[PDB]
């Protein structure tokens, strides 16, 4: 029963960076093991077949080595769409094929500041009796910011939520929502709405506001 | 073209039996192995095991052997995966994929299905708002104006949403579903576009959500705000 241990779990490196992906074996198992990319939301697709057979498509920067019990991923240049999890794979047994844990691959990149947006509830959503307002930071890095909500500049807390898109395939940057959710009976209490940024790359944190009414 | 194509979202009770399909096209069914495929969602990919068309030759890995049958139908190339009785910790979404081999040297998995994600659950479905994130100067710099849609309080996932019927792809962003106090999902698909264009061009999202027969399409219009009183 083969056992695929791949390593490291995650890493981060910059576009032009050799990146080093490695798959052990708990038996020998000659050359048939593949590698395959998986980015987020898609199916995986197969790099490397046989250890070191490259797939037709696949740019040459991709290459694998290693026979036995001990192979490796290579990407010689690493590219801002090479940003994905890797996964290598037995199939050296009678149709148990199993995976390794997978890599996930990050890229490097220049620090970018937010460009931040504040949309207030719509009319329609009023009208059912709940206020979201959406507080957008697009295309930043790196992925850590601060985001607060002030509602008539009283600092809010337990009533927003955050999500974050994946690393672009394009430019490596985050997006990031931040969701403040109120009844419309607690949203018409107030004014001033406003949302307050914090990141590396502002020099000092950018407010986001609008007063309800006026539109 | 090689292609598998699989059955939706699915929402299930525990102890409920589920089948779900993979209709292969594009290839002789019966010459290829078509294997499955377990992730959750941010981890890793689980070889469930396999199943050769020609004599539904199935092997199991050992962790699904008790509880999962694969199976075929020749006469409409598909394979199917079959549970008895689900449990909550089958939640996962599932690949179907064809085995595919050059030569003699070992094989590899490829091409894939979109893979189906199966939610087991005590809960009943509930489908989405869709609320217009409108553009406006509040989310407009540089000549490019922002704007979306709200897709708020629906269980369970997966919903997809396009922008002008899948015209619009650049600059997109839809973002992970995350889960309110109520238990519910909601998330937001926003697009960066040319402010000149917010006159001219109509933006309309395109919200489906399977497991609750929801398909919404939503205009969203831009506003002008004087800021007085």
């Known amino acids: 029963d083969i056992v695929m241990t791949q390593s490291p779990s995650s890493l981060s490196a910059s576009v032009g960076d050799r990146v080093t992906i490695t798959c052990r074996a708990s038996?020998?198992?000659?050359?048939?093991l593949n590698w395959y990319q998986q980015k987020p939301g898609k199916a995986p697709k197969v790099l490397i077949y046989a250890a070191s057979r490259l797939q037709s498509g696949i740019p040459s920067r991709f290459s694998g080595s290693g026979s036995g019990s001990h192979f490796t991923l290579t990407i010689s240049s690493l590219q801002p769409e090479d940003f994905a999890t890797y996964y290598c794979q037995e199939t050296y047994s009678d149709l148990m094929y199993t995976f390794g844990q997978g890599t996930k691959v990050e890229i490097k990149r220049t620090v970018a500041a937010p460009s931040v947006f504040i949309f207030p509830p719509s009319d329609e959503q009023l009208k059912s009796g709940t206020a979201s307002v959406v507080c957008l930071l697009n295309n930043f890095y790196p992925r850590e910011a601060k985001v607060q909500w002030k509602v008539d500049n009283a600092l809010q807390s337990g009533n927003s939520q955050e999500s974050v898109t994946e690393q672009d395939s394009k430019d490596s940057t985050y997006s990031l929502s931040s969701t403040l959710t109120l009844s419309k009976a607690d949203y018409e209490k107030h004014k001033v709405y406003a949302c307050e940024v914090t990141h590396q790359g502002l020099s000092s944190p950018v407010t986001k506001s609008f007063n309800r009414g006026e539109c | 073209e090689v292609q598998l194509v699989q059955s939706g979202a699915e929402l299930k009770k525990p102890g409920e039996s589920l089948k779900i399909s993979c209709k292969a096209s594009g290839y002789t069914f019966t010459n290829y192995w078509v294997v499955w495929v377990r992730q959750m969602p941010g981890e890793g990919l689980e070889w469930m095991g396999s199943?050769?068309?020609?004599?539904?030759?199935?092997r199991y890995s050992l962790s699904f052997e008790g509880r999962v049958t694969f199976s075929v139908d020749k006469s409409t190339t598909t394979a199917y995966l079959q549970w008895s009785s689900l449990k909550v910790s089958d939640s996962a979404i599932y690949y179907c994929?064809?085995?595919?081999?050059?030569?003699?040297?070992?094989?590899?998995?490829?091409?894939w299905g979109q893979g189906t994600l199966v939610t087991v659950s005590s809960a009943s479905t509930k489908g989405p708002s869709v609320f217009p994130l409108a553009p406006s100067s509040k989310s407009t710099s540089g000549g490019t104006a922002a704007l979306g849609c709200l897709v708020k309080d629906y269980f369970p996932e997966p919903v997809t949403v396009s922008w002008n019927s899948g015209a619009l792809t650049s600059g997109v962003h839809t973002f992970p579903a995350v889960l309110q106090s109520s238990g519910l999902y909601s998330l937001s698909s926003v697009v960066t576009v040319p402010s000149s264009s917010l006159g001219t061009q109509t933006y309309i999202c395109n919200v489906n959500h399977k497991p609750s027969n929801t398909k919404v399409d939503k205009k969203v219009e831009p506003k002008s705000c004087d800021k007085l009183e």
């Open positions: 199943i050769h068309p020609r004599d539904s030759d199935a």
């Open positions: 994929a064809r085995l595919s081999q050059v030569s003699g040297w070992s094989p590899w998995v490829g091409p």
């Open positions: 038996q020998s198992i000659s050359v048939s």
